[PDB]
Amino acid sequence: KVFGRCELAAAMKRHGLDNYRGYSLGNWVCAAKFESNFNTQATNRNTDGSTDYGILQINSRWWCNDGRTPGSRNLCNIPCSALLSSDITASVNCAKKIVSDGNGMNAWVAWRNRCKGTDVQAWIRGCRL
Ligand SMILES: [Cl-]
């Protein structure tokens, strides 16, 4: 599923990401934009052999199981393929764990490099949220 901008904002909010660990909705929408371009089915291989999955490009080394990442943990206790569903529940549950891990949203390098410090509220402009 390729989400619309306000559509993903509404789902993220309904799932409780707005102000989660102090990160405003615009931060989460921004991260999704540059991680996946709002495409739930986005997958991207990492140099280390792991793969990122879904709207927030969650990695198979620590967070989800994809059967092909040696020495992997599955701390969200989900198959990585579940992070590609049209329903973002599994991605959101897992993202809550990731962001609570100690480094906040810096865990998303694209967030750090492209969203952090910027006018993130622009990502939710025009939305009936
Ligand atoms: Cl933080």
UniProtKB/Swiss-Prot annotation:
Known role: Lysozymes have primarily a bacteriolytic function; those in tissues and body fluids are associated with the monocyte-macrophage system and enhance the activity of immunoagents. Has bacteriolytic activity against M.luteus.
Assigned EC number: 3.2.1.17
GO annotation terms (biological process): cell wall macromolecule catabolic process; defense response to bacterium; defense response to Gram-negative bacterium; defense response to Gram-positive bacterium; killing of cells of another organism
One GO MF term: beta-N-acetylglucosaminidase activity
Catalytic EC class: hydrolase
This protein's name: Lysozyme C
Active-site residues, as the UniProt record annotates them: E35, D52
InterPro entries: Glyco_hydro_22 (IPR001916), Glyco_hydro_22_CS (IPR019799), Glyco_hydro_22_lys (IPR000974), Lysozyme-like_dom_sf (IPR023346)
Pfam families: Lys (PF00062)
Transmembrane helix recorded as keyword: no
Compartment(s) where it occurs, according to its Swiss-Prot or TrEMBL record: Secreted
Residues covered by the C-type lysozyme domain: 1-129
Tissue specificity of this protein: In the egg white and polymorphonuclear leukocytes.
Secreted is among the record's keywords: yes
Gene that specifies this protein: LYZ
Anything else known: Lysozyme C is capable of both hydrolysis and transglycosylation; it also shows a slight esterase activity. It acts rapidly on both peptide-substituted and unsubstituted peptidoglycan, and slowly on chitin oligosaccharides.
